[PDB]
Design a protein around this ligand. Structure first.
Ligand SMILES: NC(=O)c1ccc[n+]([C@@H]2O[C@H](COP(=O)([O-])OP(=O)(O)OC[C@H]3O[C@@H](n4cnc5c(N)ncnc54)[C@H](O)[C@@H]3O)[C@@H](O)[C@H]2O)c1
Ligand SMILES: Nc1ncnc2c1ncn2C[C@@H](O)[C@@H](O)C(=O)O
Ligand SMILES: [Cl-]
Ligand SMILES: [Cl-]
Ligand SMILES: [Cl-]
Ligand SMILES: [Cl-]
Lengths: 496, 491, 492, 491
């Protein structure tokens, strides 16, 4: 059953994925504990969960946890390069989930996989389609195809024809559409022809989405402020045990791993530009400095810029260092931070990489389609581009996709367990509150965060991994600082 | 009227103020922008905050903006006498502060700073605004009001003021007994003093974590008697002063009071909050092996991610070499702990109050011998083991007691927030209705102002900020001019 | 070259050639040596045999020797360290005859080394004129070969020690010795004057690493060294850069590829705090690990402490630590008994030259041990009695080259510029080697002038601007404006 | 009393600091314990010229317990700790000629007096052994001999002792004029003084890089007049004192003399040798952005490998905030450089002599204005630009002039080498034959002793060494007890 419907690269890798999962679980104590405590009561029993999140070994442990808790699951990855084929195979082999994911997907396949992951067959038999009850999302793509799908269906009935914005390769402004929008639109058009009630029909059983990353949260907030959010949402990124660990310490290690795999050069002594000094940029700079690089930071936020200066880093505008720096790393979550014009001024064999969620940070399309550009494959997912007029070259890591997952295996299990423990608690919260979702009276939906009590609990579940011994307050001390002995220990606005 | 150690020290203080101002851009800019319009014109401001060179620049700023000023320090050891002299010499403020005050004189200085006179018939008023660090000015006001209400309740001095024991049986701290002694003295002179100050009080802007805690407790109990602004929780304060300020000033305090090498030593940092994080970073920067204690599992994990062992004090007390309390809590290092420490272990506190260390218990231990090693450094020897521990400045904040506190740059960021806070409180004075509400709250400054403080300090360090294009601003959903982050952003 | 080389796949050549060109952006010492000496050819006609990890960095070294006039035969000095695309690039361009591939058996390793040492003159066999050695295996086979020939002639039979699985005490010989011995036995049957015959034309060996230098010094002290030697490891621009900063980066690369776990907050034991250990520790702390050092040398131990690292004996932390990295160059540093006390899924790896640091043989042969392959060159071992497991990276072979790609080009260029200079020195003095009279050879090092020159060649890579002394300043500190700037005993 | 010190009443404070210091100075404590009964230096007359700090007072005490008679002076006008000097005199441990803030004239008079011993009746002798730091004691001896020979050759005072201008005619340093004034006086008083000392002089042990260079120059020219031991190049000295000592004591000096925050500042470290490496590490540890200058391409690459920009001073003199000289060279910061610096740039030197900075040129610049900011910190303002620079302690080693120098642990390592070096020279005295050979050399202590010094300090830091098995010892070809490294090993 699961093996026939799933689409993965190679089931024979299952045994290696299972063995890696067991090793990873030594450190993923949060997920191990949730399984231990809830596998028998099954709090998610009956829930249909669709996930769009990098299908790595760490993610396979998250999926296993959701399955042990009672959920039926369909999964896909949220990046064309981030899937670990042995991880995917492990899930299918054990019948833990129906999977549509493989490393090195085409953009078209990415959107077909996501769409298939959102498709559930009616538990009341026959050719009837349903949607998921809950969504685990990373970057907002599952949430995007749902909202855009609803928008397309309304537009479709209004003029009783395929909306023309779906049949054009051009933007409202005039420029060409990203390959991602063209592929999503192609899937949506196809669905308008199969069943133009598919998307609105899913709303009936949709109880929520838990969003993993900064960029996904930004998308959610924009929908919320415009009154367009169609389901309840939990912002997992902003849990303290997520944003202050995964984003920073995870990147401190996995950026280095991606660079070491993709870039042959020594980092020590090099001028390395980290564009953006937020949670991710802070971790990146720390790792880079740790191996002797001279980090130069760019920022638009005066506070973050001052923080960088306090760690001994030069803070400059890209234009003043573009011809002198050796390596450029984008960590902004923004777009057009490195343009083709910037790339033409870089020194011979400068390296460029992106660690933000989307490739838009770097003008990869402009680079690849520059007239007379010459490209060679240096190794898998590493390309050297040579301009025709100057004959100078730049080297780009994995077509500007998130380098730690494209050119390496992503963050290690410990921090992913902290982020994923938050995901499981978020999913449990949304599922338990499903009766409060009434699609007739209650039309307006919101984004919330998990409580500080749960945030502290996530941390407690990982202390033993590191042999950390926590101090206990006496009654006198607890009263003196005005906190309960069991916490929470900090006010809501505390920044850690 | 001022009470300071020596006015002849003024020229050194004035000279130090000018040098410091090179990096205190925020204060220099507020003086340039507002010395003519004078947004604080006529406000009576009482400050209770370490009177350092950095603080004298803050005082000069409030003065140039139009305020009348009375000032005292919030610690018996933190005043820099040359800074105090500079303010009196220039007649910028009336000062009651000196280095090495007795606890009795501390509370007399505070009480005098809160008293305003001249033909206003010819009697006592209170301040309009308070700049507070640790909450002592705010405490004496609230405890004063409480004392006056108890006084009229039974037409006699409240008995809790005339005892040496607390609501339990233990000795009251010397600070508490000296405050009560002042309140009793004021009930006899004028039992309407404290409540009389309320009609003119428009707010307090609180500098530190411990003072904010005090304010939040009063707020949750509905006992806050004036509007308050929490300056500690501005991003440009808590994430810079508390962290990077301590990273440098802790080391300075340790170098001045502890003769030993920090490299290789096991140094226990108790508390890994904003202060503790800065402390650990500076200690490691000079080769120490930092060991952390924490009650908060999130903070404990953060310490572990920086490569530090996280342990309970009882497991490392007999092996570690130096102990630094940074908790804002009480009884973190007890006399029983000190009796198990190795020979010549060093003990210091960087939290706001001395209560973190059981100094009273140590000083009153039967047969204890004490020797003064240098100014404000004492070696205590237990008579049974003959072992000694060395305590820096009687457990008072070591960076201000054994050194000169944080450097100008981070203080300018903290103090630019203070000036903006005072301006907010003063401009809104007409909104304070006493006869009606009597329900006050603690608020913070906006992110717009927080970002502004940072902008004012970028040129000091040659930082070049990038400008978003319209397309980029739209993409990340922010205005080109900020704010650039959501309210819950943690930096 | 294609006709005789033994490599994995010639088709990988173009990837090797592209990587070499990218690498050359930073290997400016080798680039400058080629520019300056490709016409004069200071090594013209020299037959050079190399036994050194055949990486992309090594390919640039080999290309440099070739442009300088040498004929070359090469093999790797570890079964796991060859980069197949690097090997293919050399063969494809006809730069060298190569006997190397990633994942050789120990049998193939020794056969490859023997082939690299065999030069034909078309008929008769010859040896190399010069040897580039890393760890001393090429030097070892020569000396053991000579010893085997002498033993063979006095008793007129194959020496008994070459025909047994055991040493003099009844203990099992290492696989490396058995395989070396089987090669020497074969050569005695083909030509019992092979090894001795090579001495005539041998002018020297330049040794890359600490462990190999130890081997040379022992031979020198016993009066058994059969050729001049240059110790490259102890050039300042080698030992203070490659060994420390190279490992700071490549240890981490090796751990990231082989060990799935997060390094931050883990107790990571670095056994040995010499030039390698210092670099390992710095890299590990750089990513948040809590480093614990073991040492036998009180000076090195004190240095670790000054950097904030706990210094303990292995027995006191073996049950609590998470990861163990051996960087000693010694043996039996991690025994089977230590491994039986480790926590579940503890990781073990070696960064020293030889696998001897960890008792891999005892672990693999432990009665009832269960072994599972986690990924290429990473194995999980489970003890039958406790049911606890340990995870060994690349069977105890140097982890930065076995599980990753070794040091990056910049530091290798510095080490390799020294190697080329050493080779030139030995070849230029070939006429002064007298086999008849002076049969006593020594180990020497390159001059401080050449050492400073190596550093000068790499300054522009990192945009370093060097200050120039005024004539008055030069007098004051008593140095020449052009150096050397430091005493011979200066430790940098 | 024959001794000349600031104040004997400070002795008690000095004695208590010595006892606290001893907790970490294990090497000196162990030498006292082991050799005080047998007294291996009994009868030796030792003259020391080395910064008279609390740490140095423990070295002197050690030589004294070992049987030596002692006379001492400091090797810098600002480095003496008066309580340390007082402690030695109070206990009769040594005759001392030292105080903090000496004039240059008094410095040379103190050194000359330290070199003068009485003959047991009314005549003088010299020392048997010299402990030197920077080579001034060694310098006055050789220049003394040279002046006596020159005096007898032409039956008059050598005119170079009365010129005021040097051989080139560019004005002698104040240090040279004062030394020459002493030598002129001693020629008129006893023209055989210096040569008469050679008889009983058995050696000098030199502490620092600059002093060793001076020894090496004399050795190479065949002019060295006594055996010498290079203590600086022991591994347990140069790799610990010079690097980790400065990492901490540079910061202490800067925090005391410079009010500004180091974080984010561009700080230039000129010279990246043993001292510079430690300075850079300390500065980075508190958030500074370190920029290095170097003449040695190897040292330059090392700096780059730690992430530091490496530039020539001319390319950064106008943008940098603070300048620290650690070269041991001269004229690395000229008056012309200082004129290009930004407003309130700070300048300091941590090398042995003040020559690294052109202090004479600055102080004598026509129309320069100078103000004392605090004790030993001066702000110089140029008349044409009205820009100012702030110089710490007139260019003298900042860690000892503006602070208390290195801490006890590393000084104990350096001083344990000194005692062993003194014991070596003393035990070899019969090999010094004036009539027979007359060519002397510089040597170093053995690696066995170098390792012993390290072993003596392991327990201070809780270090647990591993012991080699017999198989392992044979495998790496070393004795179980060491030494563990070849002679050329660089650590
Ligand atoms: N203040 C202290 O407590 C203390 C302690 C130890 C040594 N020292 C003194 O510090 C000085 C340096 O000692 P060290 O042991 O580091 O010597 P070192 O030889 O190890 O380092 C000096 C470095 O300065 C560099 N240099 C020389 N001239 C230069 C110039 N014009 N510009 C840039 N760089 C230049 C050299 O290349 C060298 O690397 C000496 O005078 C020594 O006596 C002082
Ligand atoms: N506390 C101190 N007492 C005596 N001398 C000190 C001290 N600190 C530095 N030096 C100078 C030493 O570093 C010396 O070894 C040197 O080389 O200058
Ligand atoms: Cl007290
Ligand atoms: Cl107003
Ligand atoms: Cl012999
Ligand atoms: Cl094997």
């Amino acid at each position: 059953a699961y093996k026939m419907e799933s689409r993965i690269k190679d089931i024979s890798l299952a045994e290696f994925g299972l063995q890696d999962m067991e090793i990873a679980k030594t450190d993923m104590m949060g997920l191990v504990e949730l399984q231990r405590k809830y596998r028998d009561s099954k709090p998610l029993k009956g829930a249909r969960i669709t996930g769009s999140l990098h299908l790595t070994i760490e993610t396979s442990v998250l999926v296993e946890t959701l399955y042990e808790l009672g959920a039926e699951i369909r999964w896909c990855s949220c990046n064309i390069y981030s899937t670990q084929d042995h991880a995917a195979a492990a899930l299918v082999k054990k019948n833990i989930a129906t999977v549509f994911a493989w490393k090195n997907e085409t953009i078209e396949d990415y959107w077909v996989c996501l769409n298939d992951a959102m498709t559930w067959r009616n538990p009341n038999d026959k050719d009837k389609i349903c949607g998921p009850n809950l969504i685990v999302d990373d970057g907002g793509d599952a949430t995007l195809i749902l909202h855009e799908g609803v928008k397309a269906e309304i537009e479709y009935e209004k003029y009783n024809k395929i909306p023309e914005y779906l049949e054009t390769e051009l933007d409202e402004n005039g420029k060409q559409l990203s390959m991602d929008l063209k592929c999503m639109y192609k899937v949506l058009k196809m669905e308008l022809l199969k069943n133009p009630f598919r998307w609105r029909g899913m709303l009936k059983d949709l109880y929520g989405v838990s969003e993993e990353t900064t960029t996904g949260v930004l998308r959610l907030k924009i929908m919320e402020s415009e009154g367009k959010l169609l389901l309840p949402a939990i912002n997992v990124n902003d849990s303290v045990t997520k944003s202050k660990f995964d984003n920073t310490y995870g990147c401190r290690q996995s950026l280095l791993h991606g660079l070491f795999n993709g870039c042959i050069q020594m980092l020590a002594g090099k001028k390395i530009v980290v564009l953006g000094y937020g949670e991710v940029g802070k971790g990146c700079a720390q790792g880079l400095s740790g191996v002797g690089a001279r980090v130069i930071v760019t920022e638009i936020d005066p506070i973050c810029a001052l923080q960088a200066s306090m760690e001994g880093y030069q803070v400059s505008v890209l234009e003043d260092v573009v011809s002198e720096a050796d390596i450029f790393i984008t960590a902004t979550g923004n777009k057009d931070v490195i343009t083709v014009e910037h790339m033409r001024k870089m020194k011979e064999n400068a390296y460029i990489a992106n660690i933000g969620h989307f490739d838009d940070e770097i003008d990869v399309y402009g680079l690849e389609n520059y007239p007379g550009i010459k490209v060679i494959e240096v190794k898998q997912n590493v390309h050297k581009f040579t301009f025709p007029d100057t004959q100078k070259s730049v080297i780009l890591l994995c077509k500007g996709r998130l380098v730690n997952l494209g050119c390496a295996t992503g963050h290690p299990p410990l921090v992913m367990s902290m982020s994923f423990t938050n995901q499981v608690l978020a999913q449990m919260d949304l599922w338990k509150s499903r009766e409060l979702v009434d699609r007739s009276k209650n039309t307006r939906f919101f984004v919330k965060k998990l409580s500080k009590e749960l945030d502290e609990y996530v941390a407690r579940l990982h202390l033993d991994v590191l042999g950390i011994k926590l101090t206990k307050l006496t009654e006198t001390q607890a009263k003196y600082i005005n906190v309960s002995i069991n916490g929470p220990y900090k006010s809501e606005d505390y920044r850690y």
